[model samples]
Target: RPSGTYAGLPIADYGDAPPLSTKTMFWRTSPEKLPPGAWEPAYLGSKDERVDGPSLQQVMRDQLKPYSEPRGLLPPQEILDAVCDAIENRLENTLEPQKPWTFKKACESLDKNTSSGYPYHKQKSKDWTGSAFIGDLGDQATHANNMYEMGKSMRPIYTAALKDELVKPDKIYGKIKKRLLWGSDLGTMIRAARAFGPFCDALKETCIFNPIRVGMSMNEDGPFIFARHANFRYHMDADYTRWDSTQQRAILKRAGDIMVRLSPEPDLARVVMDDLLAPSLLDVGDYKIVVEEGLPSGCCTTQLNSLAHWILTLCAMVEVTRVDPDIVMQESEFSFYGDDEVVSTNLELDMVKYTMALRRYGLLPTRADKEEGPLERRQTLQGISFLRRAIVGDQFGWYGRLDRASIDRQLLWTKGPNHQNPFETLPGHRPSQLMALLGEAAMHGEKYYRTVASRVSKEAVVPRHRSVLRWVRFG
Candidate 1:
């Protein structure tokens, strides 16, 4: 572990990802904080404050050694491909929002007007509704790599951010500034807000056709349907973002301020300037070894970076009173490359938690019936495509372009008694009930999980296994 001092306090750092490095730290805080600018989220009203994120970022950066080239990182292409294929294979067998294989077979026997099956001629209907959920797993795996690396290099991130340097460079991550000025919820909201549009859209389309058959209210337009279990999924994600944001921000800002001031540079501000945009260790080019490759295209905004952003923001919040201008409510994180593993940290963990909550719900969901895929593995985009073809027939699913204009269109309701009926409910389906229906079956594969890794410690705090739990927690 990297060792250093900040504001006379000993500092410790944890890395983010390979090739993603910088000396940074964070202190989370609450809204009551007396910093200069606003750290509280506009939507959250006045609440608690959280730390700016710099402490965690700088500390990790300081401790980790980031690499850009992809020489010896990530699992090999063969492994990645095998994983992807396994996910696809799982999709092929999934049951969907509506239409089980057994039921579909019965339909074919009864109806002669329609071909042997709907436009999408899959053996089962769940394959269409439930299969496409895991496409993001590629991104998840990449983030896991990033966390592992950061955890492995915790010592480095701590030391570099705290060590004294001759010339104080501009602090890149705004640790000190955020520490004093702001709080946590603001940071939390940033992450939760990102998913709103997509989830709302998804919920609405499902309800219009009531494809998953979760009940919806009147004026059950697109927004209302997808928002089916608003309290359960999206609403809670948003609420948690609001709740945890404040708590974490305060903690990080206090932590970041002390860490930032310890650096060799005479001017603490310089640390923030220099470290804010530092590299992440994971070399995207090298499988998951480096983070840069997958960050731009993956769930990273949700994973390492977004969470790190929380830490940095918390740091800045703590020090907002003394910080230089040009820093406001912002997110900070890193993506550096390394040889064996990836690493990560998050001050506003709610961003990570909210995703986790949804994923958990997806797995053993109260709303499990909403989707048809098994919770054990993620469904892929390719798999989802097949799912839509089966339920709504071709040209109807989200992949299809038919309902882009309307908020209420889901792929499965293309034909049938009602073509575009927004209020239609699939009275037969209670898919979310399936979570309860196939309770242990979903968890039976728990044994298949790779051993939870010890690659990164608590000081090296990345989860070792490839389960969805880690993805949601630290991503």
Candidate 2:
């Protein structure tokens, strides 16, 4: 086995031989196909009608059009400038001198320990032109070494940020302390689900539909649904290409200025400026291309991007709250996790105002996925379902259900001629564990469970292997 330390981290081994190709497997065996309804269409319509309608690509392109013009609807430039100024001032004045960030700290922060299923080979030219093209490092040693080099180079900026306690993990991820296998989205969704019921209870009387009556009130003899969950669409394709280069540069300049003002460290300030000005290099058809526009997506900058989004959202919230205090008073409201927000509020009007506020800051919300209604109990977020459930004492609650269509899609995708056990490799798919967390009610029925178990057990045993005997004997 190829195993050793590279840049102080253990190397990843992906076996000596190339794995059997899925293409070959597909030619040999016909896999179960996903149903038509399993996929969500870009637009709701028949095939012919959809052909005439705007595609997802078109929609994304249209959304990006506003950025080409003057900075429109982005809270006034002075307001955002003031917010950054405030942050820098607060950091400089209030923060005490702390230990500088070391290479060890930077290494610890890097996700070198996670078992990523990402391929250990570089992509071919034809496959490298996609919007989310993440150039691979080929092997664990190279990956680790690259990370190490990045850490060493970025240590100065990290050190400055650390001194001001700006890059705290706890602050970034809220109360969820653990590094989640699925993501922080799962944890946030869980918190949102738990808070949904209580929030509804507190504001039941204010509900636009089915307002709970206390005493001597007319018992409305009609079936009514509670309006609790509210979702808004803010489709900023987390992909870097979607953002305008000029706008990105402007934002980065402001960010760098803030960092410079907050700390007197010249090295930190220089590094931030260099990052803002640097152009990304890409390998395209027989040419080394320089991409000067927009932010580039890569492992090195993902955390930084997340931090920037968090800071911007916080600033937006602060400004919104200042303008309208009532929006903040609405209890149990959770907003934003990487552009997606799940808010629980009785007043639809409040959400309308909130959406308007976000849009004023160039955080545009689309009408396509926007949801608001009393009967909208079943909500899907981050591929998980938030199913409304009636609790034991007439209380309303939400249960997280793994999307059935998603499970089917995963099953279909993983079934090959080699018949590999998908559970072993699939990320965020610990079926038994996830089911337990989601609660038994998440199981649609015994049949679904049996189907999953059968596939798992069948794929788990190699043909004529000893494991078959072990399974049979155990059964």
Candidate 3:
């Protein structure tokens, strides 16, 4: 899908190589960036200052941690423990062989559970793909266990350093810590390696480090990253210059590392790069295509949703992981949708399970009892699913607010890909997909911005990556 420029979706189709644009860097838009009356942009970019979208993977990790903290709801510790056990077990018995380890694991689907809603009442969700899972273990138990198995399978790739006696976890972990891996997934890759053994020095310059490259789904290039157009701009962190060069070089090295691990052929590098695209996260890759789709055709909510969904989910996943890197991450599950006991599994359950958990003890409201429209009286209630809850609304910023009307209006682009439309005014209109969305998001209002105590980008980005994050600018 990197092949074409994506305004929203539909138009580009992400076919043919050469990619739609260079897409190496982008802008991050904040509410303050808005031109006077222009409402805050919806999506925030990775590198760009005026854009808005998902924060890097590293930020997500912090969000996930204290796993059950930050918000009022989260997966039950029992479930978290179960997920963790699954992750550990798969790391042990799988991956060495060609067959996918996680592919065979459980990925169940369930009906409405405690958090989602009471088994009795449900709202009419336009997302007709109703069949979905309840949790990782449950998903693996049913069909489409490939994702589960793969997640587990990656354990070996991640932990090999420790088992193979490469660098020694203590030294490596410390090294990565010193690196301040931040919110980027690439940083997480190193983090995992550090925990596994191979740290700072053991990494290969040619190794495939950017995890996003695996699916060609993630992008979010880099650039000067200035606070203002001024010559010096915002002083930039002390290590900005040094970290910028080091980060790209390190990422390229990791990409090479991944290519070597997945396959020895040099020819596979391009496809390997696809792993980084955002859509690959949920198999939504089939739909989340390039902006060129608009030029060749048209970009609309569907395309916007497709691409947006992946970025949002992945961002959430990364946040959860950041909060607790070892909090047991996996795909698939089911709970109280049709019956209190269980149900089938599929994409629909993604939100369902999270909802069920929050609603477990009446966290969410029964449709009949709840008032509607712009959710006039809806409160942050004590226990909303983290994923849903993170989608800031009302007083929250632009895209962060996931109401129906907002999503609809924000999705449309001025132009389509193939034809001639631009998400915003980036140096080259070739910023990360996340950046474009965020840039557009700024036009809306109420932005979602955050900084991890202290961390910022150094320079332009090269090679693709997701985690080892930075700031997720809000309104």
Candidate 4:
């Protein structure tokens, strides 16, 4: 850990993934078999008719015209700036402070004392009352290489954020964050953001477009559907990357001017926002590490950023719909979380218009599920899952009837040869014919339990050697 101090508080610095690092996982998951999907979406200006897309650019252009006439729908530069300003401030303040703490302290403080099938190491020595308790922070190089490496790093910038002068347990996920065998920083910000909740909520309450209230009104409002685009983060459009710093600030300044018209304190809201956008650190596998990107998922920042934009976008939508903004917010179908959206499907044709408007900002509604086709049950406008459970094929299964997709994945894990044979756990045991009779019986029962556990943990069928089977009846 690089140790130093910045402004009287202890500051720690770790080597960032230098520009030369090639190990960075872009989540491309380099497929051994060729992956499916168009290289560039048609809506982004591809001419191929085979590639699915919104109506041709000419149609889109036509749709975009008279955009403001609906209800003064399109937001001015200032509202966009206000939305932009809200996110910029969170990055500098809240999550940044917690970025420096070591993971052992962060996880242990949250009572991650167990090491079995977790990122922590087993406490072979000492007792609960002594130093033996929570023996390893996963920082030491004393365990198996793979497990040891995973535990050693506290990469995410915000493993734990400080509040009232102390590091608080991850508000939402401290309990489940370490539940995995190899912990990654994927959900750290989510947990930290949960810790930072009251602060974020205070900011939300101040805004007329509170995300929670809007997100929850899915079915109660008009027909709604949440749209998710693929690879949204990587597409740094001209507006985000090409715009100079001055131009960016101009947007925020304009937004600030607009926000003042709507709220009392643009400055206070923006300053508080700086904390949520706090920088985060994480390993890109190996020892290489990197920071995060725009409105990342699983963070408090993403929700707020999405809310900021969703509010403005919906304002524009209301204007286009020629409805009173104040009256529409109550029952209008509109919501967002990062890339996910709860938009009014009842306003059917409005989806196309909304998509056209979003394009100017380098956004695209997804090409999946024939989102442009018709009103579906699984959209945001329904009481359950906002709409239909299954569209053409599989939507998402809930309650007792397991989704076929989930069941198939469960079977794959069980059948995979990589799974450790657990017959060894029994006296004089093994997986070969020596234990075939008992093994087959045990495997049958175990498969049942593991299949059930799959609903609880994604890796439900992990090594039996590292787990105890206690399902149904306890002997």
Best by lDDT: 2
Instruction: Give per-model TM-scores.
Output: 0.17, 0.42, 0.20, 0.37
lDDT of 3 by residue, 1-475 (tens): 3443222223223221111111222222211233222222222225424333333333322222221221223334444334334333432333232322121110111212211111111221221134433343222223223322233222101000001011222322222111211111111222122221111112122112211111111122111111111121111001011111111222223323332344222233223223222221110122223211110100011221222222222223333333332221232221110001111111222333333433332222233224421111122321122111122223322122233333322322222222111234333222454354343233333332121111113112321122222233331
lDDT of 4 by residue, 1-475 (tens): 5554222223344433221111111111112222232121112122323233332223222322222121222355554444344433432222212222232332333333322211322332322333223334332312322232233222233222111110112311122111101122322422332233434444444222343332332222221122221101111111111111111222223333333223223333333234334332322121222222223222344444444455545544553555544444433444344444444423323544545554444333344443443122223222322221221111431111223433332222221111112111122201232122221222234555455444334321234511332211112
Q: List residue ranges in candidate 1 displaced over 4 A.
A: 1-35, 39-222, 230-235, 238-475
Ranking by lDDT: 2, 4, 1, 3
How many residue pairs of model 3 clash at the backbone? 167
lDDT tens digits, residue span 431-458, model 2: 4433322222223445565555455454
Q: What is the C-alpha RMSD of each candidate to the true structure, in Å?
A: 27.8, 17.6, 24.9, 17.6
Q: Give the TM-score of candidate 2.
A: 0.42
Over 4 Å off, model 4: 1-75, 78-195, 199-272, 275-293, 305-309, 312-316, 322-324, 335-337, 345-349, 369-402, 411-475
CA shift of 5, model 3, Å: 44
Task: Give the Å shift of residue 150 in candidate 1.
Answer: 34
Candidate 3: segments with Cα more than 4 A from true spot: 1-79, 90-93, 97-193, 196-354, 359-475
Runs in model 2 with CA error above 4 Å?
A: 1-30, 33-73, 85-101, 104-247, 252-266, 269-273, 276-293, 311-336, 343-361, 368-399, 415-475
What tens digits encode model 1's per-residue C-alpha lDDT throughout 1-475? 5444332223334422232212211111111232333221111101112223443333433322212212222223343333323322322233222211122222222212211111121123222233221223223323323432232211001111122111111232142321110111111111212212222233234433322222233212322322222212111111111121122222223222322232222132223312222322221111212222112211112222222233332222223222221221112111111100011121223433333433332111122235433222111222211111211112322121111212111111222232122123334312332222122122222442221121111111222233533232222
Worst 10 residues of 1 by lDDT: 334-343
In candidate 3, what residue range of length 10 has the lowest lDDT sum? 156-165
lDDT at residue 56 of model 2 (Cα atoms): 27
Each prediction's total of clashing residue pairs, residues at least 3 apart in sequence or on different chains, is 195, 1, 167, 34
Tell me the lDDT of model 3 at 41.
Answer: 23
Candidate 3 global lDDT? 0.23
